Subunit: 317 residues, 3 copies
Amino acid sequence: HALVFSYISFALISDKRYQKKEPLISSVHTKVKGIAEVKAEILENGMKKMVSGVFDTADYTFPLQGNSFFVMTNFIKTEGQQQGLCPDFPTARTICSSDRGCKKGRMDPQSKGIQTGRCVVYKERLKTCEVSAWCPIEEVKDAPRPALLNSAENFTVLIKNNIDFPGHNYTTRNILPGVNITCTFHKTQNPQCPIFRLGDIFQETGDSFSDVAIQGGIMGIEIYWDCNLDGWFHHCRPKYSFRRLDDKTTSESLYPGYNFRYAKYYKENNVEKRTLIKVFGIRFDILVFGTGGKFNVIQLAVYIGSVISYFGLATVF
Amino acid sequence: HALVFSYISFALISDKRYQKKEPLISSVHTKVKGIAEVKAEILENGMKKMVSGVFDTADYTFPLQGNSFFVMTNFIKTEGQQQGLCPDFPTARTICSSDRGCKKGRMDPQSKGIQTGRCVVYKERLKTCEVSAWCPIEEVKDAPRPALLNSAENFTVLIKNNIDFPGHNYTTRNILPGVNITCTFHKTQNPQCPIFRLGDIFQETGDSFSDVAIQGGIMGIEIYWDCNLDGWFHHCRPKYSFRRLDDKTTSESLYPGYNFRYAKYYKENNVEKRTLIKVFGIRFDILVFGTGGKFNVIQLAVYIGSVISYFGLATVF
Amino acid sequence: HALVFSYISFALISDKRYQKKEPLISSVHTKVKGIAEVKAEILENGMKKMVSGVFDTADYTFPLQGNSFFVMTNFIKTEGQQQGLCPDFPTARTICSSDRGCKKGRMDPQSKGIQTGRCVVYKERLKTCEVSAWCPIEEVKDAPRPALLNSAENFTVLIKNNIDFPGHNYTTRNILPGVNITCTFHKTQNPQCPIFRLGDIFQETGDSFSDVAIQGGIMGIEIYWDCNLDGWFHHCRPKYSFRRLDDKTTSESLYPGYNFRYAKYYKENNVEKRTLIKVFGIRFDILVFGTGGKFNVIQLAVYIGSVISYFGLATVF
Ligand SMILES: *[C@@H]1O[C@H](CO)[C@@H](O)[C@H](O)[C@H]1NC(C)=O
Ligand SMILES: *[C@@H]1O[C@H](CO)[C@@H](O)[C@H](O)[C@H]1NC(C)=O
Ligand SMILES: *[C@@H]1O[C@H](CO)[C@@H](O)[C@H](O)[C@H]1NC(C)=O
Ligand SMILES: *[C@@H]1O[C@H](CO)[C@@H](O)[C@H](O)[C@H]1NC(C)=O
Ligand SMILES: *[C@@H]1O[C@H](CO)[C@@H](O)[C@H](O)[C@H]1NC(C)=O
Ligand SMILES: *[C@@H]1O[C@H](CO)[C@@H](O)[C@H](O)[C@H]1NC(C)=O
């Protein structure tokens, strides 16, 4: 009988039924470091071109917005586009035998322009449907074989997190004072180091960083706060985990990976022009979840409220 | 008497008091499709101008940041601005009879520059207060009558959501494998289709897409997760709803609609210049709320704790 | 004895144990107003330069993304950078006595380029390690003494918040209809005014706006919703508080303040060039927390469930 009430008291102790718990408030500030040297050969419009250059922080990333940041790992440039008419890029949907194959005004999800209803030669007696759009249309080409910014895994993101508990008067930050900032997070050797190498993140989740860096993906950093605001036992430290939020579908229809089309408008020869940059990379979403706990009498009097009935039926047997 | 305890047991079953519930973690990835052909006539500075051009994804949208994305539906361009002095645009506040009407250094919330304290002619013996700013000052003109990118309603946003339950070992995604991705969400015909036409969203909420697209607004996509992590009955699917978060005030003071001023800096003739683009559109905020539920003994022993007292008083009558 | 049951009933009344509480859904829309006149003298590469110009909304801010916005308060420009080789900027780590001091391919976290392994003169027989990068390398210089956009504190952010309670059928907005929008938030004189002067925010938190505006920081706006969805007593208004989320470390290693490196690519003389803008400012994170409360029988029958045991043991004494 009494051991049953020690099981109730156990449920209280271990389940922290005596504590009030409150959802944590998270603010995030991330600063990434590293530079990537890009020397590769890439064929554009059937002509080989040499891509050489250095990429510093400004060239491959922007500031954190909404608790997530992005790291361009690959890209494709289509310079000199300008408003006009041009034959769409040859694909199963763009290729026409005669003017009747193209319907004027038609626009297909794969096309970047509105059809003109006319069939015209793209190259060497091979005709696609003419469209109106930014010309010439970007190639329906795959990303470079090895990701141009393959060095991305060697980069290091420094994460600084500030968690607040409105219910209590308690606020704290990921980086406690006086810690040795020279470190690299390790599941075991540096569980509280806020410097994270990207390749390490991809290994922890068991995903090859290069593969994802070719077409892009969405990684995810989780920060757990099981904080105890009690004077007796008080613990409040983060728990870093890693999960690949990216879907990994691998189906043209579900737009696999992570990539977006960036536009850089400029004027040349009194003409309105636009360089189009298809950008691939990993987007890192930082997910911070917390629960603050303190001693509460009302919760112990309600838990007592249930335990006194449980006690009456326990004594009835 | 016993029917009272069947009412308690009912409250348990229907209220899921036996389950532990946990807040869901949401990651969002949105890819929008569609292109808008813009041919319209718009008067700038008293002179008619012809706006013709095609707008692809890159021209009217940027990537999702913070679980929300934006779709430019209208705009106004003020090309060639450069640092200098110019007479402010004529309005009830800018118009002066004499140099005494303007105070040097004064800046009014409607003005885009600091007054020079001098009264100067803007056009045809009509004087406004001279200011220092990007010159010439953007017209205090209304947005184009029909939204230039009125085609926006025909666009389709594909939403991909990944929800995780840290408490459990359970993670899932909006798009289950093998589904027919060729679809358009319908309240009844496609409750799980993640392709959403914008016009459909505006109809569901009962707002004309054109009206909002003229001056801009903030729409809102809600995704409900009432997931049951029990082995007996396990359900975990999203519930799409639509709500217009935009205020719809219609008062100059409350800055109605959604619009922002974008700056494009460029150099011409060894001069620093800036094209100013007032941008109008709908911002789409994706709100994902979830609750995961599993069987918990401590909660059933505490609910039992209350139900045994309720039982004692029920028997006392 | 009975006073004990009035203490239980008190815990019910004051703790609102009879109510079901639900987490609030927050949407935020912020429009900032103000313009800053920048006239200052700043030395670049050992030569004095005069920075004069006006800065309107477009020049110093972008739209809210993820419930936070940014206000550039200071900056440093490095115009004309272009891909090439150049001697790194002289610092304790870049300075070399001989070619042996530099290792080819080496890249240090402070460096913005990959070393060429060669020691070259930066200026006046003082040699740094040659690197490949955007040349010339940005100066390792401190921000301007008084923040160029020191006027930032006089700016006014208008915040418009829309909170929804999915559980109930209840939705509301920060700005109730018909209120006098002409106001400035005051802890006591305007607790519901949604116009916030920045300097006021920094004073409330007890931080000098100028100091933070020199190197940058992360401020934080909190909006409390302790809403009561009961018909008897119904209150649903926001509670504005201010907290400095910024860390304030003041250690080179922890990247103190708030600043990022922005890149503006342009072409000159058939050459690829890049103006680099180190941007400093305050990022304002808007934290909205809410709890909606209504009357619930199941919660009053479970609280009664605990209170009937508490009653039995109370009577046992
Ligand atoms: C990344 O760094 C490792 C050393 O940690 C090096 O062996 C490897 O070659 C580097 N890879 C790239 C692409 O820079
Ligand atoms: C930090 O740790 C590294 C070794 O990981 C050591 O070389 C360095 O001296 C330490 N610095 C401080 C300040 O403790
Ligand atoms: C949008 O598409 C519909 C067909 O679904 C068409 O009737 C309508 O004219 C289109 N409107 C615009 C502005 O493209
Ligand atoms: C998907 O559904 C459409 C009809 O809505 C049909 O035409 C198409 O063949 C289907 N595809 C698959 C793979 O089921
Ligand atoms: C800010 O405004 C105050 C008046 O409210 C004025 O006294 C002060 O000089 C202004 N400072 C700047 C930097 O504009
Ligand atoms: C708003 O209050 C100000 C004083 O703070 C007053 O001058 C103005 O007339 C008021 N406007 C309205 C519409 O109440």
